[PDB]
């Protein structure tokens, strides 16, 4: 269960995290983060590149674990283009809601991850024949994870988590009608 998009995303994250270590956070942040200034708004990469930045090794590992587990499943059973689209829609939207929640200084792949969780869960629910599904041990831990960010158990992007979750559920629900 190793598709091209799964691994290309993992490599990107690792490539970006290395650069953050050579140059420091702020330095990469100033270039990849969501536009802080409407003057920068046509720097179109920014709406996606925030997802690549991680600020702790544990975080890049945790996120890439989820991404490889759930991203591999979508790409294996449903195709690479399907994974591309979940990724781009949810990076864009979870970044958008995160910016409104708390402004432009945020990063990480977990908005995309929560949108993969929403997707794989509702898709395997409404649509078993797709061959993907989320275990209830895992949506135990997804549900525990959103709410831990709530209560500040830890400095989480909370717009990001909730925005992606919604994105994933919404897309899985659409897809489980055209199925």
């Amino acid at each position: 269960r190793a598709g091209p998009v799964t691994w290309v995303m993992m490599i990107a994250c690792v490539v970006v995290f290395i650069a953050m270590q050579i140059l420091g956070d702020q330095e990469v942040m100033l270039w990849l983060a969501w536009p802080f200034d409407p003057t920068l708004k046509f720097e179109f990469w920014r709406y996606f590149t925030h997802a690549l930045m991680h600020f702790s090794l544990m975080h890049i590992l945790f996120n890439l674990l989820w991404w490889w587990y759930l991203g591999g499943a979508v790409e294996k059973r449903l195709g690479s283009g399907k994974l591309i689209v979940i990724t781009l829609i949810s990076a864009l939207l979870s970044g958008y809601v995160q910016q409104k929640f708390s402004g432009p200084w945020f990063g990480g792949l977990s908005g995309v991850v929560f949108a993969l969780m929403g997707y794989v869960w509702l898709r395997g629910e409404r649509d078993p024949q797709s061959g993907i599904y989320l275990q209830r041990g895992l949506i135990i831990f997804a549900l525990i994870w959103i709410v831990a960010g709530w209560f500040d158990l830890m400095s989480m992007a909370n717009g990001a988590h909730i925005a992606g979750l919604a994105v994933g559920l919404a897309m899985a629900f659409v897809d489980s009608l055209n199925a």
Binding site: D25, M29, H50, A51, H54, F55, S56, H59, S94, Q98, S102, W105, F106, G107, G108, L109, S110, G111, S155, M156, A157, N158, A160, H161, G164
Partner: peptide
Amino acid sequence: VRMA
């Protein structure tokens, strides 16, 4: 910052 905040981590997503």
